[PDB]
Design a protein around this nucleic acid. Sequence first.
DNA 1: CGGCAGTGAGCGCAACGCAATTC
DNA 2: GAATTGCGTTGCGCTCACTGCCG
Lengths: 62, 62
Amino acid sequence: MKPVTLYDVAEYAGVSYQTVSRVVNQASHVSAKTREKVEAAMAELNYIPNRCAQQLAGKQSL
Amino acid sequence: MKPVTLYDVAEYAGVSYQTVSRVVNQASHVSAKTREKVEAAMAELNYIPNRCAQQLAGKQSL
DNA sequence: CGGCAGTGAGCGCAACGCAATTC
DNA sequence: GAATTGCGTTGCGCTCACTGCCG
């Protein structure tokens, strides 16, 4: 009925959303405490980068 | 890559971006004389009406 | 006044930047 | 002392749909 959404992982992790997807995107100065939770959320809901809102968001390819 | 979307094909045909997409969704009364014209222009300019954008667009599923 | 096109807005993830604050 | 948090949006194509543009 309903697939996965980044917003779900954000709320499950209890973080500012940005910190979640940045771990699989380009995490740099993220505290171990912060990544600890977001990893749990990403693995819990199974976060798969879908090809839809990626091209549209303004990627290097439409 | 060239960001030629329904916005660029509009001016090229002398219309808006709705006449262009008109044939992509249903292809109803497209001016009656510009139905095949836009379709041809699409193939000519190698215009690609996305792949997943039209899905998240006009969802109306909520 | 009537046909038929055009604009408007929303959906989703992704990214920028410098200093104060917390660990 | 050095890590680390953030903010908050747009915005893009693309859709529908009603309403206005041009006649």
